[PDB]
Design a protein around this ligand. Structure first.
Ligand SMILES: C[C@]12CCC(=O)C[C@@H]1CC[C@@H]1[C@@H]2CC[C@]2(C)[C@@H](O)CC[C@@H]12
Ligand SMILES: Cc1cc2ccccc2[nH]1
Ligand SMILES: Cc1cc2ccccc2[nH]1
Length: 248
């Protein structure tokens, strides 16, 4: 399982948010911590992506593009997984020092979005998702959103996406027997993958509005976060860049 060896081998390690928990919760502090966590996580996601099989085939501008458009979903999907494995989806485990309970979900002023994310975490349990299926689905998420106008070199991207989908089928096919199970399983995983986009979309809208009024609510946005959310995210919210869905 060469391909699986790579995903397993390059999977990012634990990342902390640097949150002061001995300090009373507040909107400004929580969101500022989540943002810092984004900056820190982005760094790992970039190093992770550049190490994926065939990623370097993509044109350099397209490499940065898919990462800049997919980080939200990637991060949310991995966050859901940690929440499932660490606390069986009891809370949102953003980081070791940033675990969201119902109080924080509410205090973050993004309770509805958090509920959305916890529900995704629950799915990992309800579908009995394997660590390997998780890994393969996550890799596939990096290639699940592109500009309606296409990429610099769409042809390579298309080839790459086709291969990662082919790998997901392999994972499903192995350790299995019933051809009806393979198809059903693929149906469920693609359904799950699609369910990530609406959550990402809601978060994009939220962080965008947050960046705009950040100065008023006293929320901090690190360099890369401020740049990406003001330059790349708007392209998604305006319909110029959209998710690739399996199902209609
Ligand atoms: C991606 C992060 C940080 C990494 C993670 O574990 C998922 C989580 C989802 C909510 C995001 C947060 C980064 C900072 C954002 C974008 C805030 O501005 C509003 C929504 C937050
Ligand atoms: C490839 C790449 C993507 C990206 C996003 C934010 C900052 C730097 C980056 N390099
Ligand atoms: C996942 C993946 C398999 C593979 C084989 C050849 C070239 C690129 C590839 N990506």
């Amino acid at each position: 399982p060469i391909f699986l060896n790579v995903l397993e081998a390059i999977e990012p390690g634990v990342v902390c948010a640097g949150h002061d928990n001995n300090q009373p919760d507040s909107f400004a502090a929580l969101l500022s911590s989540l943002n810092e966590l984004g900056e820190r996580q982005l760094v790992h996601v970039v190093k992770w992506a550049k190490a994926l099989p065939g990623f370097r085939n993509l044109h350099v501008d397209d490499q940065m593009a898919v990462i800049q458009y997919s980080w939200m979903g990637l991060m949310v999907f991995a966050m859901g997984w940690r929440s499932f494995t660490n606390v069986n989806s009891r809370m949102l485990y953003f980081a070791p020092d940033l675990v969201f309970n119902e109080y924080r979900m509410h205090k973050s002023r993004m309770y509805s979005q958090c509920v959305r994310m916890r529900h995704l975490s629950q799915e990992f349990g309800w579908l009995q998702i394997t660590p390997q299926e998780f890994l393969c689905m996550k890799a596939l998420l990096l290639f699940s959103i592109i500009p309606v106008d296409g990429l610099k070199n769409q042809k390579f991207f298309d080839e790459l996406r086709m291969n990662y989908i082919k790998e997901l089928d392999r994972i499903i096919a192995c350790k299995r027997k019933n051809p009806t199970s393979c198809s059903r399983r693929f149906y469920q995983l693609t359904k799950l993958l699609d369910s990530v986009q609406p959550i990402a979309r809601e978060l994009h809208q939220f962080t965008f509005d947050l960046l705009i009024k950040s100065h008023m609510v006293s929320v901090d946005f690190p360099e890369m976060m401020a740049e990406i959310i003001s330059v790349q995210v708007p392209k998604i919210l305006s319909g110029k860049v959209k998710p690739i869905y399996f199902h209609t």
